[PDB]
């Protein structure tokens, strides 16, 4: 009947969305791995937001330029058309159903003087990301910097006031995607019990830090192979923070073994018990030039003189991505967590 064709399609959408979530997590773990090779110390970024940024590029490329991006994001094929819109519609729904989540995302397209964008790409960007177009003069670099930093400061609500540092005058288009997460703990820590405590930087050195304290039902498990505790710190709106604490000072570096299956194994072995939790407050602010990193993930041609972005522009040929920068700030607190990521892509002539 009419249900038959739509009932099969819902099963497929349900399957495809699980596949996309899994692929985004693994994409994230790949990045964490690449990033860690250069940066010791604290790190934070948004896999979801990073892969939205890249899929934004991808729709716009063709040939080896496009297919290299699909591989880098782990975006494997699906079953048998024209059902990509339904997949994005389904993702928005899922991220919109729970009004307590506190998650907003958005997208900008900053465009150079009279550089005409193809119509089908403009449309899709609004349909999939609700992209907002703003004319620009990147030749007048100092002026464009101030104007773009105003827009990102507005939308990130003051937490990333200066995303842009230097402006390449040969820039024809830059795509910015942002993600804002205002999470409230499902049971907040009472700041009356926050105390100064000893944190171990390594086997020899220590430092004193504010430790928040909660006592009650928490979900956790102990992986005996990696010798680590995993703990769920739930938010309102059906989000959660997984915390992974290694028992011994790096030894078996988790980064290199981290996969969707390992996390699924932990989530399966969780048990809930009355327990006491000490957990430190922290702010992070990190900034990563993704260009060379993405190149290591096999996304090459988009950055080369032979980049094919002919779905982004009809005529324009000598176009390429020169820079992909990601800036992420997080603040963990007695009330919850507030995390903002901004991601920009410099398209150059």
């Amino acid at each position: 009947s009419e249900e038959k064709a739509s009932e099969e399609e819902k099963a497929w959408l349900m399957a495809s969305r699980q596949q996309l979530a899994k692929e985004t997590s693994n994409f994230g773990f790949s990045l964490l791995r690449k990033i860690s090779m250069r940066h010791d110390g604290n790190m934070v970024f948004s896999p979801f937001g990073m892969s939205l940024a890249m899929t934004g590029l991808m729709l716009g490329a063709t040939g080896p330029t496009e297919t290299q991006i699909k591989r880098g994001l782990h975006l494997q094929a699906l079953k048998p058309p024209g059902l990509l819109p339904s997949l994005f519609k389904g993702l928005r729904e899922t991220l919109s159903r729970n009004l307590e989540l506190g998650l907003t995302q958005g997208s900008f397209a900053f465009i150079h003087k009279d550089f005409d964008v193809k119509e089908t790409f403009f449309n899709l960007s609004k349909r999939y990301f609700d992209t907002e177009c703003v004319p620009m003069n990147f030749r007048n670099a100092s002026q464009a910097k101030r104007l773009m930093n105003h827009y990102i400061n507005k939308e990130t609500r003051g937490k990333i006031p200066k995303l842009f540092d230097e402006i390449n005058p040969e820039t024809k288009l830059i795509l910015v995607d942002y993600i804002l997460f205002k999470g409230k703990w499902l049971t907040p820590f009472d700041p009356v019990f926050t105390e100064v405590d000893t944190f171990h930087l390594d086997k020899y050195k220590t430092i004193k830090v504010p430790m928040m304290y909660g006592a009650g039902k928490f979900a956790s498990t102990f992986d005996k192979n990696f010798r680590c505790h995993v703990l769920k710190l739930p938010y309102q709106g059906n989000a959660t923070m997984l915390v992974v604490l290694m028992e011994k000072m790096d030894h078996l570096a988790l980064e290199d073994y981290l996969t969707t299956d390992l996390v699924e194994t932990w989530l399966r072995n969780m048990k809930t018990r009355n327990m006491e939790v000490f957990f430190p407050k922290f702010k992070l602010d990190q900034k990563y030039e993704m260009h060379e990193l993405l190149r290591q993930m096999g996304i090459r041609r988009i950055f080369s003189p032979f980049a094919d972005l002919s779905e982004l522009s009809a005529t324009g040929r000598n176009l390429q991505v020169s820079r992909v920068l990601q800036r992420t700030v997080i603040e963990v607190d007695e009330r919850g967590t507030e995390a903002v990521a901004g991601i920009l892509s410099e398209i150059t002539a």
């Binding site: 944190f199 059906n238 922290f282 995390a339």
Partner: protein, 36 residues
């Protein structure tokens, strides 16, 4: 007769997930909480 205690008093990894979709929103490592 004595509740377990988990003390995050050493470097750790964190992941913020939206549980309905399964999307990894944020991913990180904290090696020293007193600085950016």
């Amino acid at each position: 007769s004595m509740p377990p205690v988990i003390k995050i008093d050493r470097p750790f990894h964190f992941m913020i997930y939206e549980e309905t979709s399964g999307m990894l929103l944020f991913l990180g490592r904290v090696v020293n909480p007193t600085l950016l």
